[PDB]
Amino acid sequence: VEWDAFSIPELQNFLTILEKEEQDKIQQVQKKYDKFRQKLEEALRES
């Protein structure tokens, strides 16, 4: 992509989209680690 072709507001929309994508994957891994504690812990309760 030749990003030099876009304007400030446009380009800004892209940074926003990449951030919206980042937060949605940083929270996708948190939901992964918080579903893992709830299983390691429930397993400790079986010991």
- Least Å distance between CB 31 and another protein? 12
Task: Give the angle subtended at the CA of 9 by the CAs of 27 and 1, to the nearest 5°.
Answer: 75
Task: Give the angle subtended at the CA of 43 by the CAs of 40 and 37, to the nearest 5°.
Answer: 20
Binding region for another protein (CB under 8 A):
1, 3-4, 6-8, 11-12, 14-15, 18-19, 21-22, 25-26, 29-30, 33, 36-37, 39-41, 43-44, 47
Task: Note whether 3 and 11 are within 8 A (CB).
Answer: yes
- Least Å distance between CB 41 and another protein? 7
- Least Å distance between CB 24 and another protein? 11
